[PDB]
């Protein structure tokens, strides 16, 4: 079938409430869907649930190609290779230059070494991420670490390009600038899961905004607002 998870409750005990109610959801492949969730309730565990780290204790999780619950030693990294993940931290590598930072995720998966040089100009200098790529990342500004962070996540055109708080510590004067970079991937039609809690930031586009209270889904509007 297709990308659909339902009846997923890991049932975390030793707590007042597990906040895992086995919610059945149905999401297609396409544009950007926003998960405007409150803090400490349904963000980290939900993001980890499709990240194939903590297995669900009830039901199973399905993706269009693979099975998440049913696996082996070789089934896990094939699922792990086809998903791109963007996080809050910049997580650069200080001991190496920038031009091979995006190439670092290519020799560890079994690609042809000379063929990387046929891919790195197609990936690095694609959309506004040209720069010079031959500087130390310590002396570089903070406004372009996230530009190569999302470049590391998109190197072989994967299916899911999920991002969690791209602005974060960034000022709102330049958050609209990096949003303009974010929507370029959304124009390509690839699946993206964008989860943040920022009022009057992503409310301009009025895309599919969802919310939950205590593990139970309470908002599902395809053109809703946050409030």
């Amino acid at each position: 079938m297709m990308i659909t998870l339902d009846h997923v409750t890991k049932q975390y005990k030793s707590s007042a409430r597990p906040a895992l109610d086995d919610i059945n959801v149905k999401i297609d492949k396409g544009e950007f869907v926003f998960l405007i969730g409150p803090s400490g309730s349904g963000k980290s565990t939900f993001m980890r649930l499709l990240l194939a780290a903590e297995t669900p204790t009830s039901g199973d999780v399905r993706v269009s190609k693979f099975h998440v619950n049913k696996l082996r030693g070789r089934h896990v990294p094939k699922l792990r290779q086809v998903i791109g993940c963007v996080f809050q931290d910049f997580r650069l590598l200080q001991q190496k230059t920038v031009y091979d930072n995006v190439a670092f995720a290519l020799e560890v998966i079994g690609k042809r070494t000379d063929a990387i040089n046929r891919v790195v100009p197609e990936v690095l200098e694609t959309v506004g991420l040209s720069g010079k790529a031959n500087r130390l990342p310590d002396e570089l500004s903070g406004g372009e670490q996230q530009r190569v962070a999302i470049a590391r996540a998109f190197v072989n055109r994967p299916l899911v390009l999920l991002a969690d708080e791209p602005t974060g510590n960034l000022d709102p004067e330049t958050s609209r600038d990096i949003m303009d970079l974010l929507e370029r991937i959304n124009r390509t039609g690839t699946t993206v899961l964008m989860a943040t809690h920022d009022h009057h930031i992503v409310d301009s586009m009025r895309q599919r905004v969802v919310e939950l209270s205590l593990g139970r889904l309470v908002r599902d509007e395809q053109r809703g607002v946050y409030g």
């Binding site: 990240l51 030693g73 990294p77 094939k78 699922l79 792990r80 290779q81 086809v82 993940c85 997580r91 650069l92 590598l93 001991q95 995720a105 020799e107 560890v108 998966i109 070494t113 590391r152």
Partner: protein
Amino acid sequence: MRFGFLLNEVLTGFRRNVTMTIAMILTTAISVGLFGGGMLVVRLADSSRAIYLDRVESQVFLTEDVSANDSSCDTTACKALREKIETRSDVKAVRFLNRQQAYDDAIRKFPQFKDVAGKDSFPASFIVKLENPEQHKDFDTAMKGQPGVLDVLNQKELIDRLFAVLDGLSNAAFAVALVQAIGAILLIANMVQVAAYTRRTEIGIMRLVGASRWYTQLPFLVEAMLAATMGVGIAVAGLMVVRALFLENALNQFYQANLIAKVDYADILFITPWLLLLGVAMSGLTAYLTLRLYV
């Protein structure tokens, strides 16, 4: 095979934890060195056994009433026992000895005890050579109370208790080598708990890229594999420099006396494949299991 990337990623690990790369090699080298320093002790023990086993002579005393009366056995009572046990199977020559010559031969050996030992204390005897000194238990059991024999001295087996003094020190060296090994093996487990802390920023993204379970641990394993390489090399170099500095004033003294094995540098490198494989043995599987049980 991506060999040049593995060639130069290991240099950052050596540049990171510079205050432990020496200590790990020192403790493994010390742990393997005195463990290696006991097999050659056992070797020289068994080799010095052979240079005395070749010339052990059997000696059996006689009763006093057949020895105090006559020095030479010419009576038929001693001659019948003389001619019966002297050619059976494990004999090459039997030498009869008198009593009076068996008194002053000790005086010719040394001019001591010349006054404190009487004439009437040295029974007549025989000297018998045996083909195989290892099979001594036959004539131990072939000799019981017979009319003319008083006791059996059981050839010359005073050599085993002479050389038994070094078995205790070899056992002590092996025991303290064992306790140094049990105090050294857990450092290999400590390396993986200190090295993964130095590279937390890359192991997380290398986990979520889809890397192989069989290939995620090689940069955490090849340095522990090569750590056992130079450790046994400096261990045998230290063994060279302790043999060539503190034993020439001891072992060379027994050379002209021709009493020891006289080992050298050649047989030391003969046992090196039996120790370098043991050195790389526990460095591998322990490091493999401690990453599987922690990471």
